[PDB]
Amino acid sequence: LVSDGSSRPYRCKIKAPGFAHLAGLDKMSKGHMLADVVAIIGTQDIVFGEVDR
Amino acid sequence: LHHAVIPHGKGGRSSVSGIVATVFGATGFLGRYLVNHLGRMGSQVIVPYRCEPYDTMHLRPMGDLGQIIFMDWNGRDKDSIRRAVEHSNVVINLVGREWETKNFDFEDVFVKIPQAIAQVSKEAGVEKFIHISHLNADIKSSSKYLRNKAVGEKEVRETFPEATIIKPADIFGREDRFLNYFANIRSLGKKTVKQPVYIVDVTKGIINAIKDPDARGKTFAFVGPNRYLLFDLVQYVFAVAHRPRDKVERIHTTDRTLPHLPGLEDLGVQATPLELKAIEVLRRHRT
Amino acid sequence: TYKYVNLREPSMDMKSVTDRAAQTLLWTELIRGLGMTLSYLFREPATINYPFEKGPLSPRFRGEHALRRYPSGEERCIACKLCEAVCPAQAITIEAEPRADGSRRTTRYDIDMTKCIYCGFCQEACPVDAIVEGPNFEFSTETHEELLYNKEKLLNNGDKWEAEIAANIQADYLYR
Amino acid sequence: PLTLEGIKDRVLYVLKLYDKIDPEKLSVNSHFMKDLGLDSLDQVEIIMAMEDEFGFEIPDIDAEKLMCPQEIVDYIADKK
Amino acid sequence: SRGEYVVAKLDDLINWARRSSLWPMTFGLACCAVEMMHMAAPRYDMDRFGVVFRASPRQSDVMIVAGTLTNKMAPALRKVYDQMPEPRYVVSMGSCANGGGYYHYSYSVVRGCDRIVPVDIYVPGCPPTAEALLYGILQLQKKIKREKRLRIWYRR
Amino acid sequence: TSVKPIFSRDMNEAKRRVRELYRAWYREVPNTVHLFQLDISVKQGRDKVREMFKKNAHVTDPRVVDLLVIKGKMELEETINVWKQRTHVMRFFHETEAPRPKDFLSKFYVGHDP
Amino acid sequence: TRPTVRPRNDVAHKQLSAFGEYVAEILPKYVQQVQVSCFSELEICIHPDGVIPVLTFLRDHSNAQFKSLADLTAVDIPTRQNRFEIVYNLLSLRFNSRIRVKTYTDELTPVESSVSVYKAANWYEREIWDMFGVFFANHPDLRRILTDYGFEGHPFRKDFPLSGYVELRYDDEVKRVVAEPVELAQEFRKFDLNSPWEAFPAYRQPPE
Ligand SMILES: NC(=O)C1=CN([C@@H]2O[C@H](COP(=O)(O)OP(=O)(O)OC[C@H]3O[C@@H](n4cnc5c(N)ncnc54)[C@H](OP(=O)(O)O)[C@@H]3O)[C@@H](O)[C@H]2O)C=CC1
Ligand code: SF4
Ligand code: SF4
């Protein structure tokens, strides 16, 4: 949170574990196949709303 | 006139524009594009249908929130038609099946339908009534189609005389009839000179004429830019498309210009050629 | 404090290694999974017959957006604009006028059912409990025109019932 | 069959083939940029158009240094 | 008028055959997808209504647009809509999807899915409760009960 | 006053990079108009490309020219891939009116647009 | 003062004060502010040249480990010539403490692309480039991620308004989806909530 002396926040921002987990997908899946990639997307819990910020 | 019929601000997406249009038809081709360009203009369209609401459903979201409105009509009673044209600024008449049915001929749709709607219109007090017609529909032979359209032309000219009787040539587009029959072939080869006019210049002309007053009373006719042979056009269609009785007689019948009545140039719209839009629309061939 | 996993070894004793070989070549715990799933087969399944049996709820559900009124009296709303001041998608639209009597009232009280996220802030913000989140949740509306409530629609929807709303509030006017 | 005059003739008819040039009006000292009313946009159009016509890549600084028909012909005579 | 009698009976049979199973495709962008999977749950059934949840777009009877439609989403959404058989119906689920909703005043968001595909059944809520969504599918079935296609074809 | 520019020293390197970027856009157009199964002649597309270049010719500040070159390179990458669809490429064009001219009296009929 | 008001520890305040004084003394080349709030979370305010040297110091040295990287944002503050604020956030695995490395920057001059020492900063830097336009020289790949491709404007600025300039709709004219200038259906009303009367006397700035 970034707050002016105010009732409105000046700037909020969210550190998202979904975004951080999706960030390393190439190095997590350099040596496998596509169903294993779907299992990689599964094995890090995803909502795809929080990954957006 | 009352407020909320005057224009307001810019155009598009429920900006309150001028005309409130009662449209007969609009489930077909040209009426659907006309509702599309009035929705781009931002005009309220009252359309009655007679069919299943699924057709008016897949042409429903053209307008903004609650702009266009759907109701019912029938080809028999004046009460439903009059209820549909109780409060209307402008009204357009587009109707017609190109084959006779069990309950309708080429007669009495083109004859009986403009009679009752023009009756309740002239008793109603509508303005800028635009009635379509096929080009060169005569008293002459070869088509119950064309002669019943000529009778309807004489009717709309005689009663309610300040109607814009409008006619394009045989139009081509995304859902053309005759270019589809050119695709749905087999064959035969004849000669006829012919000018094709693309659909969006036609409907742009119709919306410009219906929103621009002082251009009333005069019948209009739309002109194709090329005007060459039919069989050369069929060779052009097969070349661009990569592959080597009533409709065929009514395309071989008559295609001429008339120096009496004014066309595109008194409206100020650019004409799109056959070649550009034909290359745009001739998809769905082999790869 | 931590309690981690996967710290063992396959036991080199003959019985344990031939048991792992028996599971490998005899398909055992797969059939154990089949037995567990057949045990859930022989249960009675927990379904509800939907059009006849409706699923249970709470006395504080947030549904219909109905209005209330006074006992044999007039409209409960004052048009004090608190609900439009708190409405986090601004779906409330209030234009207020007083009538010929003198008490301050409205002209236009519109709820957009599209924008309504169903918080409950307009219920908590109402000082006189004029707007109340309703009990029933069946809108299912075939046209987008019909999903924009007017104040008269809200009054008809508050006069189709109060006894449900009054029973829920009279049960739970003590928590909130 | 690769002389200076054959390259100049093929450069000549592709200058004929370019549309906005009015007329061709070839000269060894033509300078079609300012003496014929053209843009540096049209300069780089013609330079990479010759690149599209008959060969080597013609990079940016040598694309800048030409500004002239016969100097293009002589630069190709240097490079080809 | 046994011609009309056969038309009415055959129309009843074919429309009951349409509204009987109605397997959808779950498009399901945001948390409305989670509530759709909660009406896929063992309490609120879908087996009873012939309704099979299925990701296949090629055989989609109805389509439940749910979640939050964006500008980046919309051409791919209508491309999903195109490769679909012409008897088709649309349930717009969710305040986000049936008119913009809580993200109505924003950029990158189409103001409801009315501006892309036509909508038969709007069901509002955030999330629209699985009970209420199942009610909306019942009123969709009653819309299928009133369609009169073969009546219009016979007296056309 | 210390300002660190991106690439530029004078506008010579600016001219050099923008003419190379225009060469890249020229050899970019026909492959894309063939790949996306588009509906526009190549002449019209190239003329709208060079019209978009000629829109911002009024900038002499070299950092701004560098940032324009970097933006154009970004969108040339994203259109030389298949990452951008038919919608964005048509969105560069304007075939849906948008009819608004700059006449005084035309803006006086459909008013309140000074 | 004691019930329902959160008490604090002056011990952690003294620890962070001494630590920030230590870091300020031993990297004098770029330290401008070392400020400590009331609830003991450290802030170090840094010139935009010592990005790589200060982060290479703060990753290591066995007195401030701070391996854990978090948020990056550049809080858009006008009424300045250096507008944007790049905020590194660092967490120590070994010491359980939070330091905020606020370096300042302007619109067009790059800071030096912290992805060289921080492998978590890659999509963070790509996000800041997409939403703001803070350029990052010596970076592998800068693209637009968390925006549309054909959209531009760098929307998390203050110059970009709430609604976008463009708005999509499908049309059957050209049989596809097109963008138009924005035609809102309602105003997005603006409540003048900035009430007077000085709710905090301690944070008064000196007027002119
Ligand atoms: N090249 C061309 O095709 C040209 C055509 N025209 C004219 O333009 C008009 C529109 O053409 P087009 O779209 O191709 O054809 P359509 O048949 O699709 O248009 C007629 C419309 O009126 C409806 N309609 C027709 N007959 C009846 C009826 N008996 N009862 C109820 N509704 C009826 C149609 O179906 P529904 O009932 O389902 O709504 C449709 O909505 C026609 O009148 C045609 O003559 C003019 C010049 C050139
Ligand atoms: S808060 Fe209650 S009384 Fe006040 S305007 Fe809203 S509904 Fe009316
Ligand atoms: S529940 Fe609906 S009407 Fe009430 S404050 Fe929330 S969005 Fe507004």
Ligand code: SF4
């Ligand atoms: S309406 Fe509510 S539950 Fe549905 S997608 Fe939007 S935020 Fe999620």
